[PDB]
Design a protein around this nucleic acid. Structure first.
Ligand SMILES: [Mg+2]
Ligand SMILES: [Mg+2]
Length: 1196
RNA sequence: AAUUUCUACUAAGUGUAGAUGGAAA
């Protein structure tokens, strides 16, 4: 049989639809008469205004609660913080977090908050007219309620004002208290508390307000601003201009050796993209010469001009990629400080033992990550002698602000306020890109200086630096908000997706659908022939649909009808115990008591007989209930098979749906449209057309099978459909046209037909140049799933009873975009091809489509376009569509082969400089991938068939997070692809040796670590046998014995082509060696010049090098292995390229793909070792040692 | 150079192929 035969009735899915609503008859004229546009347009307009009023009264509410609660744990907290044990402090910090959570939530009203009542009465106390108009429209603000209930939880996020008031502000407060205790000797009694307090408040002393017992009092924003008035100063309502205490420390530069830390301010809490001239004006206003941005930049200039004068111990930079970046900047290469730290740390932890284990490696990397921040002193230690790296980075930011000065001096001409913008933003792209150069210069500077924090939480620190540092940084951070705002106004389309929902004076509109409650819902899907429509009714004619007949007038319609049934588990005890049924039934007192206790629910109170008699009471009460017994010919299953109540809840849930058609008539309700008493919109797409012949949307098929009589098992709508309204963006006159009868030269270079001539004009994007109606319809999938199991485990069960599991290998290549391989469950490769060309199996002749040549044209355009954001979004979404094509090809291969799917993990993965497909692109790839695999249906089949819309394939769980993709989602496998590109598949061979030349002594020991170097004249080759245990870090090998050989040729990057043996022999004849008397390793060691051994190191690098690519031409990018097979031949890619189906791979792409296949093959081999109850606990992530053993042994 | 929307087209001439889950910040 097949292996896809279990992945149906597993779990639910919710989605929606989006469709065109075509006005039919007098409907557009009638809404134009009755003026149903301006009011919800105005409602959408002042929805932001009343939102702002809600924020205003929310600040009123929290300021009302901001006077009451007093805290106690602060007294021990300030001591255990300030006393220079952190797990105990964190355990008490949990108590602090709980106490402030209680102080936030459990007090002071806290009731009429996110309901109807607040906007119904409280905010009334347009503005009153606006709230009256906004009544009963709370659904428009439910999202605001969910958005605005965020501040009171335990989230510790930016939303959390408890985190915001404690975790930074109290800490900075106590540190400022202690700094005040440090510098209180310079504070004079005439200045710092007499004039300032007796002007500001005349309240209690500043030596009172430096106590921890006043932070609870100054928890308000008034305390925040009076704190920052102590720091900096205040206008004080006149021209008095009071001083600040930080300014007193500033004027304590009279000793010219200040060395005092400042005071940190407090964090309080709580726009653009309209016009081009507007955003350029706000750009100039944010970025002018006397702007706060500019002056903070100048502050950084003076600060980091005199940066060399402070504490090297008290300065810190964090961990990240930027430390490797600054390794490249200071010393020249990438991981230099990294392996310097390994050189120290392995002197510490590594003993005199030579081998480094894998656990040593991963825990060493874990320690490297765990040290999240660094003072400069160990960095100077890893630096060599006479290297002021602080002066080095000082000169780096000096030349960075020099280039900033350069872009200023070349770009200030737009800041001429008298100069006017002449053309559009889409026209003056030169100065647009100039502005872009400004912003990316600032962005590169902030990412470069972004390491200069240390994220501490640290020891003693130059806070005299760090306070002014974060003072400049708070101004200079929101440049990103400015950046992506103006990037958005760059990247926006010529149109927009602006839309506004319409209610027609009905808050009870479009929620329920199937039930006879359309006097409130007032809308119903209609059909004639195969053409589907939407009919909407007025309040005065809500029961217009009663007087409808079939009546055989040769005009007939199809009224959607029956009863959906939502929420049965909550609906049934309500309707059966609301006294409208207590009065109709007896009711039985024993089952009333059993329900009001709960002895049928699970949780060690459950009795199966009590549950079953509750079910049979539900049976007889439902069969006696008229509105459900006369709507469903009820046929449940038998009583004794019911294990619980939730299963029968799903049975009544599936039996609460019978949607089909009433036979209506046509002409009288078209007349009711014409009289204005019917509102009438045609459900529309492109595939509703008369011209519709090809392959429509799967979503349209979904819509059809809402009314397929055989879809009882079961796909059906979700209630609560919406309808928005999209006006025009551009004008129909103002479009550029390709005319009737005109030879229009085609764009695809793959069709032999190159020019199109057709007999009607087409416009510029006509659907976007007019005012159109858009319906939005939700859809339900698998509400009552039958086959429930644990997914990945049952996959492993199928693999346990497998005989020969086929597998898809999935990887991006270098000159290839994507590559897919077919391999069996015994490592025998079946099929392989790249996916650069993309073919459609379509009615007449199949035609391929290459995205690769497209991307080459786009990179050419971006080279002659100076990398504008238009090109960036261009190539990004070209990738985004391309991968959507890829995954359709993927799942087509899945339904062909019933295979298993494995991909490069990025939770530990890396990228190597060549594949165009990004981490973000690949992330989008896998997310759309797992979404497509969350339900899999071929359109072309019978929808009722296995694979069709009834019986498709839910093979995976829903997406959780980017970090959640952890080695498995069922058939999905997030693979550590370490050491998987440069790898011999034909034998199982890899180099482990670092071939960068270090020393001549290193060269000589590298020679003598080999045991035999022998020229052979039979093959005209060179024998290179070796033991890996005479080499460092070769622990993962299993064979370790390899006679390397050297025929063929390779490519120097420089591209440059070199053949191996000729290069060897010319070096040996130039340095004077009879090479025909091996072994001569001591004779190689006998040389002394640097040139021979460096060139020899280079030649050895060529020998171990396997991949060559010319990187400009698609063809000549080849591979070559140095070690023969089990029968005496090795593998080159040029000897297996021109093939159709061989056992070999074809390139590095197929190599890595075959690697993936062998990883999951080993995973199945592990599954063939343990018990079925243990397969969940089976560790999955293969390591290098058993990986190479698998590679060397299963190679046969 | 058309589209419920997105991508590549122009497929036999008002579309073709695919992907396509929205409201909320
Ligand atoms: Mg189609
Ligand atoms: Mg397009």
């Amino acid at each position: 049989m097949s292996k896809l035969e279990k992945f149906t009735n597993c779990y639910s899915l919710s989605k929606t639809l989006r469709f065109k609503a075509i006005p039919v008859g007098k409907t557009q004229e009638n809404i134009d008469n009755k003026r149903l546009l301006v009011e919800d347009e105005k409602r959408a307009e002042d929805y932001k205004g009343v939102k702002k009023l809600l924020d205003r009264y929310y600040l009123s509410f929290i300021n009302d609660v901001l006077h009451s609660i007093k805290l106690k744990n602060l007294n021990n907290y300030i001591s255990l913080f300030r006393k220079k044990e952190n797990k105990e402090l964190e355990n008490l910090e949990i108590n602090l977090r709980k106490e402030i959570a209680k102080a936030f939530k459990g007090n002071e009203g806290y009731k009429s908050l996110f309901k109807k009542d607040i906007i119904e009465t409280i905010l009334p106390e347009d503005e009153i007219a606006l709230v009256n108009s906004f009544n009963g429209f709370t659904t428009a603000f439910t999202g605001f309620f969910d958005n605005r209930e965020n501040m009171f939880s335990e989230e510790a996020k930016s939303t959390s004002i408890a985190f915001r008031c404690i975790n930074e502000n109290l800490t900075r407060y106590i540190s400022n208290m202690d700094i005040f205790e440090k510098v209180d000797a310079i504070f004079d009694k005439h200045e710092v508390q007499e004039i300032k307090e007796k002007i500001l408040n005349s309240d209690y002393d500043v030596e009172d307000f430096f106590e921890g017992e006043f932070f609870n009092f100054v928890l308000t924003q008034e305390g925040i601003d009076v704190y920052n008035a102590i720091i900096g100063g205040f206008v004080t309502e006149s021209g008095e201009k009071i001083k600040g205490l930080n300014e007193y420390i500033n004027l304590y530069n009279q000793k010219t050796k200040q060395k005092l830390p400042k005071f940190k301010p407090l964090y309080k809490q709580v726009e653009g993209y309209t016009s081009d001239e507007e955003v350029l004006e706000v750009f100039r206003n944010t970025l002018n010469k006397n702007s706060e941005i500019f002056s903070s930049i100048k502050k950084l200039e003076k600060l980091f001009k005199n940066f060399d004068e402070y504490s090297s111990a008290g300065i810190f930079v964090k961990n990240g990629p930027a430390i490797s970046t600054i390794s490249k900047d200071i010393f020249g290469e990438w991981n230099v400080i990294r392996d310097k730290w390994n050189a120290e740390y392995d002197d510490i932890h590594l003993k005199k033992k030579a081998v480094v284990t894998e656990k040593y490696e991963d825990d060493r990397r874990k320690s490297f990550k765990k040290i999240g921040s660094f003072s400069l002193e160990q960095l100077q230690e890893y630096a060599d002698a006479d290297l002021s790296v602080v002066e080095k980075l000082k000169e780096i930011i000096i030349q960075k602000v020099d280039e900033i000065y350069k872009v200023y001096g070349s770009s200030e001409k737009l800041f001429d306020a008298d100069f006017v913008l002449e053309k559009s933003l889409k026209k003056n792209d030169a100065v647009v890109a100039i502005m872009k150069d400004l912003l990316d210069s600032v962005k590169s500077f902030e990412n470069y200086i972004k390491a200069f924090f240390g994220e501490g939480k640290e020891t003693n620190r130059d806070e005299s630096f760090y306070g002014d540092f974060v003072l400049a940084y708070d101004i200079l951070l929101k440049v990103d908000h400015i950046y992506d705002a103006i990037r958005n106004y760059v990247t926006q389309k010529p149109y927009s997706k602006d839309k506004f929902k319409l209610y027609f004076q009905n808050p009870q509109f479009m929620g329920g659908w199937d039930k006879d409650k359309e006097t409130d819902y007032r809308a119903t899907i209609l059909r004639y022939g195969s053409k589907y429509y939407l009919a909407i009714m007025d309040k005065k004619y809500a029961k217009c649909l009663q007087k409808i007949d079939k009546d055989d007038v040769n005009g007939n319609y199809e009224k959607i009808n029956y009863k959906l049934l939502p929420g049965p588990n909550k609906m049934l005890p309500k309707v059966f115990f609301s006294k409208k049924w207590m009065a109709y039934y007896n009711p039985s007192e024993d089952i009333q008591k059993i329900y009001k206790n709960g002895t049928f629910k699970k949780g060690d109170m459950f009795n199966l007989n009590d549950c079953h008699k509750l079910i049979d009471f539900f049976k007889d009460s439902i069969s006696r209930y008229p509105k459900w017994s006369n709507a469903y010919d009820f046929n449940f299953s038998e009583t004794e098979k019911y294990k619980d109540i939730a299963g029968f809840y799903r049975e009544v849930e599936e039996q609460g749906y019978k949607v089909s058609f009433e036979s209506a008539s046509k002409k009288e309700v078209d007349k009711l449209v014409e009289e204005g008493k019917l509102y009438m919109f045609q459900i529309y797409n492109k595939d509703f057309s008369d011209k519709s012949h090809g392959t429509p949307n799967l979503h349209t098929m979904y819509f059809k099978l809402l009314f397929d009589e055989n879809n009882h098992g079961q796909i059906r709508l979700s209630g609560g459909a919406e309808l928005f309204m999209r006006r025009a963006s551009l004008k129909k006159e103002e479009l550029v046209v390709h005319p009737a009868n005109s030879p229009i030269a085609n764009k695809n270079p793959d069709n032999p037909k190159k020019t199109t001539t057709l007999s009607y004009d087409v416009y510029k994007d006509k659907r976007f140049s007019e005012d159109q109606y858009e319906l939005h319809i939700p859809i339900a999938i698998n509400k009552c799933p039958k086959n429930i199991f644990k997914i990945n485990t049952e996959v492993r069960v199928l693999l346990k009873h497998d005989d020969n599991p086929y597998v898809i290998g999935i990887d991006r290549g270098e000159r290839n975009l994507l590559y897919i391989v077919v391999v069996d469950g015994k490592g025998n490769i079946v099929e392989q091809y790249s996916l650069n060309e993309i073919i459609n199996n379509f009615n007449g002749i199949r035609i391929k489509t290459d995205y690769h040549s497209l991307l080459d044209k786009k990179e050419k355009e971006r080279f002659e376009a100076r990398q504008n954001w238009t090109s960036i979004e261009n190539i990004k979404e070209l990738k985004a569509g391309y991968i959507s094509q890829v995954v359709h090809k993927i799942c087509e291969l899945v339904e062909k082969y019933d295979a298993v799917i494995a991909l490069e993990d990025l939770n530990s993965g890396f990228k190597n400089s060549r594949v165009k497909v990004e981490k973000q692109v690949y992330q989008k790839f896998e997310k759309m991938l797992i979404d497509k695999l969350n339900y899999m249906v071929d359109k072309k089949s019978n929808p009722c068939a296995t694979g069709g819309a009834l019986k498709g394939y839910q093979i995976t769980n829903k997406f959780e997070s980017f970090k959640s993709m952890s080695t498995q989602n069922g058939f999905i496998f997030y693979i550590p692809a370490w050491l998987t590109s440069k790898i011999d598949p034909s034998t199982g061979f890899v180099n482990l040796l670092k071939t960068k030349y270090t020393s001549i002594a290193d060269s000589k020991k590298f020679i003598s670590s080999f045991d035999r170097i022998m020229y052979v004249p039979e093959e005209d080759l060179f024998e290179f046998a070796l033991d890996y245990k005479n080499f460092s870090r070769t622990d993962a090998d299993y064979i370790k014995k390899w006679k390397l050989y050297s025929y063929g040729n390779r490519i120097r990057i420089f591209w440059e082509e070199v053949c191996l043996t000729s290069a060897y022999k010319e070096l040996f004849n130039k340095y004077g060696i009879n090479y025909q008397q091996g072994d001569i390793r001591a004779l190689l060691c006998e040389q002394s010049d640097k040139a021979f051994y460096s060139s020899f190191m280079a030649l050895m690098s060529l020998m171990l090098q396997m991949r060559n690519s010319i990187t400009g031409r698609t063809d000549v990018d080849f591979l070559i292995s140095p070690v023969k097979n089990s029968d005496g031949i090795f593998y080159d890619s040029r000897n297996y390229e021109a093939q159709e189906n061989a056992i070999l791979p074809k390139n590095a792409d197929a190599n890595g793909a075959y690697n993936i296949a062998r990883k999951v093959l080993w995973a199945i081999g592990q599954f063939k070792k343990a018990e079925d109850e243990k397969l969940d606990k089976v560790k999955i992530a293969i390591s290098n040692k058993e990986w190479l053993e698998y590679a060397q042994t299963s190679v046969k």
